[PDB]
Write a protein that binds this ligand. Sequence first.
Ligand SMILES: O=C(NCCc1cocn1)N1CCc2ccccc21
Ligand SMILES: [Zn+2]
Length: 140
Amino acid sequence: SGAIYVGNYRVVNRHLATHNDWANLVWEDSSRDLLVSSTTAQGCDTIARCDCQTGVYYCSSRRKHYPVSFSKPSLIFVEASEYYPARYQSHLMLAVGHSEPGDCGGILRCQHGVVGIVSTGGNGLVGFADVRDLLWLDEE
Ligand SMILES: O=C(NCCc1cocn1)N1CCc2ccccc21
Ligand SMILES: [Zn+2]
């Protein structure tokens, strides 16, 4: 589990969104596994605006933050899980890093701020959903 809290937005994995998220929906995209809902309180996270390929992510199944090298956001075939059929997921970045289902939502960050959240993984893979192209998270 986990979310990004930037401005009056909450960014979560679409497959983990709650009824309150769907009832206060700003934007969602199944191909990216992302959903954004509105919040009453302002958040403290800042979004990175960059092309970094190194950063650190939080792994809840190890209670640890790990430094990783990750690929640029791309369209990658991901295997069936409880939440999506084997399909192509867009804006996804891969790294070698330990992963399990309850980790979705952990933040990946670089020197500039939050880069994305954990979404896919398996066999020493972990795939993040990028948010650096969503410039509107910084305003309104
Ligand atoms: O179950 C999921 N993610 C579900 C969301 C998803 C995105 O694309 C398809 N399903 N993951 C995330 C971490 C992990 C480690 C080992 C095995 C699976 C998984
Ligand atoms: Zn960066």
